[PDB]
Design a protein around this ligand. Structure first.
Ligand SMILES: *[C@@H]1O[C@H](CO)[C@@H](O[C@@H]2O[C@H](CO)[C@@H](O[C@@H]3O[C@H](CO[C@H]4O[C@H](CO)[C@@H](O)[C@H](O)[C@@H]4O)[C@@H](O)[C@H](O)[C@@H]3O)[C@H](O)[C@H]2NC(C)=O)[C@H](O)[C@H]1NC(C)=O
Ligand SMILES: *[C@@H]1O[C@H](CO)[C@@H](O[C@@H]2O[C@H](CO)[C@@H](O[C@@H]3O[C@H](CO[C@H]4O[C@H](CO)[C@@H](O)[C@H](O)[C@@H]4O)[C@@H](O)[C@H](O)[C@@H]3O)[C@H](O)[C@H]2NC(C)=O)[C@H](O)[C@H]1NC(C)=O
Ligand SMILES: *[C@@H]1O[C@H](CO)[C@@H](O[C@@H]2O[C@H](CO)[C@@H](O[C@@H]3O[C@H](CO[C@H]4O[C@H](CO)[C@@H](O)[C@H](O)[C@@H]4O)[C@@H](O)[C@H](O)[C@@H]3O)[C@H](O)[C@H]2NC(C)=O)[C@H](O)[C@H]1NC(C)=O
Ligand SMILES: N[C@H]1CC[C@H](NC(=O)[C@]23C[C@@H]4C[C@](c5ccccc5)(C2)C[C@@](c2ccccc2)(C4)C3)CC1
Ligand SMILES: N[C@H]1CC[C@H](NC(=O)[C@]23C[C@@H]4C[C@](c5ccccc5)(C2)C[C@@](c2ccccc2)(C4)C3)CC1
Ligand SMILES: N[C@H]1CC[C@H](NC(=O)[C@]23C[C@@H]4C[C@](c5ccccc5)(C2)C[C@@](c2ccccc2)(C4)C3)CC1
Ligand SMILES: *[C@@H]1O[C@H](CO)[C@@H](O)[C@H](O)[C@H]1NC(C)=O
Ligand SMILES: *[C@@H]1O[C@H](CO)[C@@H](O)[C@H](O)[C@H]1NC(C)=O
Ligand SMILES: *[C@@H]1O[C@H](CO)[C@@H](O)[C@H](O)[C@H]1NC(C)=O
Ligand SMILES: *[C@@H]1O[C@H](CO)[C@@H](O)[C@H](O)[C@H]1NC(C)=O
Ligand SMILES: *[C@@H]1O[C@H](CO)[C@@H](O)[C@H](O)[C@H]1NC(C)=O
Ligand SMILES: *[C@@H]1O[C@H](CO)[C@@H](O)[C@H](O)[C@H]1NC(C)=O
Ligand SMILES: *[C@@H]1O[C@H](CO)[C@@H](O)[C@H](O)[C@H]1NC(C)=O
Ligand SMILES: *[C@@H]1O[C@H](CO)[C@@H](O)[C@H](O)[C@H]1NC(C)=O
Ligand SMILES: *[C@@H]1O[C@H](CO)[C@@H](O)[C@H](O)[C@H]1NC(C)=O
Ligand SMILES: *[C@@H]1O[C@H](CO)[C@@H](O)[C@H](O)[C@H]1NC(C)=O
Ligand SMILES: *[C@@H]1O[C@H](CO)[C@@H](O)[C@H](O)[C@H]1NC(C)=O
Ligand SMILES: *[C@@H]1O[C@H](CO)[C@@H](O)[C@H](O)[C@H]1NC(C)=O
Lengths: 238, 121, 121, 238, 121, 238
């Protein structure tokens, strides 16, 4: 049975189905709420290398979608445009009525290629991809999502700025995926797991104001010199 | 069962977003043609970890996933909107789905004021 | 609240159309292959303004629009079929969603024949 | 909360949610009914010029559809085929399972062009477009609809002829829309708000039987000479 | 009504397939990415004709078709998933949709232990 | 009203709606079940000639789908690929989320042509086409289905092998339909109603091991020489 949360003795609890509490009062369907909570809040690494390793392709499993009524402002969200090396799309278009997650401080937009050995892309840990009040078992193409999980509750009776960070990827969804952070269409930075969103934006501004952008028609790629707390608490550059 | 948070960390503050169905609009803002776009229908709030509610919710949603995923595997509905209504029906059947034996444990009827009214007569 | 018709006019007669779910068919007309096409599934009726019901209905539907539109804005369901079932559930929770205190105002239990049966004993 | 109608003291009323009436009996879901009532019945002008001014285009608002079980025979319905001047369609195809309003004395079929500055066409007064037992916030292409509003009720426990009138339109949905009533593919009448459906049909028959149809390959357009009760109660012609 | 099987034959044994929503998975099999494909989510069972249940079911489903088809004709929902939930609501309204008159025939309240507790006092 | 089955006095019964049985206990929605039962079980002929005569094409009736939770292992299922003589498809593609019936001992895959005078193909006796936990009033293209009917129940409170048999058909859905059983792409057997699935498989193996396959580039068709119990209880060949 699907667990239902309830407050007894100043503590959240799972309601015992085999037990009947007549003191529990449910006076309207408005007391029942479905909520979505972000994996961020549990302390999972949110950098693009770590986050993409949690997803994978699989065939033979029909996608499923479940509704949820309230969600959490996310620090990190993701938006994927992945093709196979022959240009065929890897992810399906967003079904009618499915929009991106509504509150994202940083949207990590990843574009690139991979083998995509499977009809749909699932969460390897069983979590959901959270969209605008709909949770899916699979990733949709070019649609912003947060990783999360859903809860169901009995309530007791009684600005916003977003920033897009673009990445190029090769060998997406494999053991040896390569990631480049995009400054402009001809200037990239070799991406490490340790690079935070705030550091990528300061790296982009300092590159723009130092003239370290490509002033030819070819690709310029930088590599940052090598020189434990969550978010709520070629060439070289040294 | 009690909720045992077993996650590596917990953001104890819940900055949340949702919608309001009741919201009495100002003038003509309820008309879809004049009202907000999809991006501007949300309300926000902030909830702290009083009674450890926030860290319990993070742990509750985590423990809900297995049962929820098994429920979605066994349904043929592409988008499921009926879980909370089915829980409301189940709440009523658990209490009123059989004959209600007064003073029994599976019947939520209080004959207190009725037993005292009879004693007064 | 009472229904105050505030429209410029009122057609007091309601020539209506609907379907019937129960309709015991004649022979084999219930088989989709043999039965009526989409255009021929309707029944008709005519209702006059006794008790001012018709003009109230025109005014009731007008006053329903705001709440209804705000409900549709906040749902992600593309086509909503569940409003009347949710109202039936809410009708039951309003009455049976807590412990029923007999002779209290929020409990619809009548101990009349039970109180007289005890007096006879 | 969505209001619910109920009969107390020989009068329809809105049920008080904060008040509990144990004498109110709901014994089956069959006692609950959703009904649709036509704006016609409230006295709104139903002529094509007046009716189209109540609709408008808007982007960023997802369409929504709600079911209703019983409806009212309409005198006037509408069926739109609107393209932009570049031939792209302005209204979307009817979704699967959405059919035209089932009882219409007169269907005003309007074909023409307009700027269509918006993804979908909404009712400016917040009313609905009533289809076959489905109410939509937006107009679908080539699908017959009546303007109306929905009510929800607790019931207390216990031929058909249609005529199509065709119009051509330019500058649809603007301050200066022009309308022509169509006699045949080469004969039109300059349209006024005061022209009723019955008058348009008698104007069409008298034109057919007077020989006032175009007997060339070009367009003939007539203008009727200038020579307060609801429905339930170039060249010139003088 | 009683169930009168009027079919030319009856397979009295019912080899059936279904799914289980509760099924406590072994380890990580509940994760869609790791779990069974669409073809491998089914469980099986075999039921014999004790109490003539199997032949009654074949006759019951046959007699259900007319009402069911007429219900589908009158709905605009493309795929209907709500019949059993609507029957559960109707079960509750039949019992609790009005004032419950104790000892009356349309009220399922038992004052047995309450009537004896009063006699003891 | 839709009948509901219930067990009283060791017998299945239809619940009386106008009668209230307080001894009947419904403690959770899990006690309610929808089940699907195969026409096979009632003794209908399951051979391809007899089975296809029960289906027919009709326009103007919208298709409808109803869910069911448990089904019966079928001996016979059917899978149709029917085109008109001009190559246009006769049956619609399976809607998203509709899969074939999950347990079929023999799948009779029929390919051919017919007039297909109707938008959709219905069951002439009012039965359903049973798919994976969804019952439809119409046949979908290339999707395996069993013929069946649905029941609704109140429960009282408390390997698999499949074989495909291919047929070619001409004049599908008429008085004079011709059927050929397919051995390979160039060898067929004139089909009779009396030929059981087990007999068709033994006829195929004996043809393969006797060398009676076509060893040219043209069609070879055999006709079996002429030389009352249900399943649970050119050239010639003599
Ligand atoms: C609910 O919360 C649970 C606890 O927070 C989540 O459990 C996670 O489950 C996944 C698998 O489903 C584990 O990932 C596996 O890890 C092992 C080895 O662990 C490696 O990573 C840890 C980091 O915690 C590190 O300390 C070790 O030294 C290993 O390097 C791999 O062999 C597997 O292939 C797989 O990657 C997580 O480790 C585990 N997290 C924790 C904190 O235990 C559970 O997934 C949550 N459920 C949902 C639906 O979100
Ligand atoms: C429910 O019923 C209400 C009353 O019948 C409806 O109210 C209507 O609301 C719309 C706007 O939402 C009004 O239209 C506006 O009118 C003003 C000026 O009024 C002009 O038209 C009136 C005709 O009544 C005329 O007498 C005046 O001299 C003006 O020429 C404009 O400035 C606005 O831009 C807008 O067009 C209607 O006037 C109003 N009707 C009435 C009778 O008051 C309400 O819309 C209904 N709700 C639904 C959902 O149908
Ligand atoms: C529920 O069970 C009922 C009884 O088993 C099913 O009744 C079947 O209804 C169909 C029509 O809907 C009948 O078919 C018609 O048959 C007549 C003449 O009968 C011919 O076939 C019988 C074989 O039983 C044979 O004995 C006769 O000599 C005739 O050759 C035709 O004229 C019609 O055109 C039509 O084909 C079935 O005969 C009838 N079966 C029985 C056993 O009575 C009913 O269809 C079931 N409902 C569902 C939804 O499955
Ligand atoms: N129409 C109104 C009805 C009440 C509704 N309120 C909520 O949706 C809460 C508002 C806040 C935050 C909360 C939440 C959001 C995201 C993720 C998890 C939870 C949602 C939980 C909530 C709560 C949870 C547990 C116990 C008590 C309250 C408090 C309810 C607002 C609209
Ligand atoms: N299966 C049967 C159950 C009863 C059902 N009947 C209605 O659908 C009414 C039949 C008529 C007209 C009415 C209506 C139609 C269109 C618009 C508005 C209302 C619909 C309202 C109704 C009514 C309204 C208010 C109080 C009492 C009755 C009377 C019910 C017929 C089928
Ligand atoms: N989560 C669990 C809840 C109980 C569930 N069990 C059924 O789905 C039955 C399991 C068997 C067979 C039966 C059936 C299958 C196909 C067609 C018709 C009937 C389905 C009927 C059933 C039954 C019918 C009538 C009376 C009593 C039992 C017995 C129930 C298994 C999963
Ligand atoms: C790469 O993937 C293959 C197969 O998935 C595996 O054998 C190998 O260990 C992986 N890692 C590296 C570094 O090659
Ligand atoms: C960069 O590339 C994208 C996609 O290739 C393109 O849409 C965009 O206009 C480009 N920007 C510039 C400044 O050329
Ligand atoms: C990088 O810096 C330039 C300079 O202001 C800015 O215009 C651009 O948007 C920045 N890129 C990102 C991803 O913020
Ligand atoms: C041109 O590119 C070189 C190398 O990337 C860089 O050093 C130089 O500053 C650029 N030009 C300007 C004007 O910044
Ligand atoms: C036409 O529309 C414009 C802008 O919408 C407006 O300025 C003007 O008043 C309208 N009417 C006429 C007669 O131009
Ligand atoms: C009139 O025009 C329409 C559409 O252009 C066409 O379908 C119809 O056949 C025409 N009628 C005649 C009589 O030409
Ligand atoms: C106009 O009159 C002719 C003459 O009978 C008729 O055939 C035609 O249908 C009429 N048009 C309309 C719109 O009624
Ligand atoms: C031809 O057209 C003219 C002008 O429209 C009209 O007067 C005349 O009657 C028409 N011919 C016939 C035969 O009616
Ligand atoms: C063939 O079909 C036609 C019309 O459907 C009918 O007249 C005839 O009896 C049928 N049978 C044969 C053997 O022609
Ligand atoms: C037989 O025909 C089918 C379809 O025409 C084709 O897919 C298959 O490969 C063929 N088999 C052989 C052995 O040629
Ligand atoms: C016919 O026999 C051959 C010989 O083994 C076999 O390969 C083939 O699958 C058989 N066909 C069917 C439909 O079983
Ligand atoms: C070739 O075909 C003939 C006729 O179908 C058959 O008699 C013969 O056995 C076939 N060849 C072989 C090697 O089986």
């Amino acid at each position: 049975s699907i667990p239902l949360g309830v407050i007894h003795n100043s503590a959240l609890q799972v309601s015992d189905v085999d037990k009947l509490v007549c003191r529990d009062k449910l006076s309207s369907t408005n007391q029942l709420r479905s909520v979505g909570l972000n994996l961020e809040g549990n302390g999972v690494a949110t950098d693009v290398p770590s986050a993409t390793k949690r997803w994978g392709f699989r065939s033979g499993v029909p996608p499923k979608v479940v509704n949820y009524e309230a969600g959490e402002w996310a620090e990190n969200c993701y938006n994927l445009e992945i093709k196979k090396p022959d240009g065929s799309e890897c992810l399906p278009a967003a079904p009618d009525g499915i929009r991106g997650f509504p509150r994202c401080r940083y949207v990590h937009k990843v574009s690139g290629t991979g083998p995509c050995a499977g009809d749909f892309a699932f969460h390897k840990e069983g979590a959901f991809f959270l969209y605008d009040r709909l949770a899916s078992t699979v990733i949709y193409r070019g649609t912003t999502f947060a990783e999360g999980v859903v809860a169901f509750l009995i309530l007791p009776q009684a600005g916003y700025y977003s920033t897009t960070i673009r990445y190029q990827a090769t060998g997406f969804g494999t053991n040896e995926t390569e990631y480049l952070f995009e400054v402009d269409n001809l200037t990239y930075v070799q991406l490490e797991s340790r690079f935070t969103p705030q550091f990528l934006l300061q790296l982009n501004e300092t590159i723009y104001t130092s003239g370290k952008r490509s002033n030819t028609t070819g690709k310029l790629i930088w590599k940052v010199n090598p020189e434990e707390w969550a978010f709520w608490e070629x060439x070289x550059x040294x | 069962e009690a909720i045992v948070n077993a996650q590596p960390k917990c953001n104890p503050n819940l900055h949340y977003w949702t919608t309001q169905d009741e919201g009495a609009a100002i003038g003509l803002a309820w008309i879809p043609y004049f009202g907000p776009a999809a991006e501007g229908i949300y309300i926000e709030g902030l909830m702290h970890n009083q009674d450890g509610l926030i860290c319990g919710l993070r742990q509750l949603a985590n423990e809900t996933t297995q049962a929820l995923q098994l429920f979605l595997r066994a349904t043929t509905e592409l988008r499921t909107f009926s879980i909370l209504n089915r829980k409301a029906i189940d709440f009523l059947l658990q209490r009123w789905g059989g004959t209600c034996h007064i003073l029994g444990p599976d019947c939520c009827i209080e004959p207190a004021d009725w037993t005292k009214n009879i004693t007064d007569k």
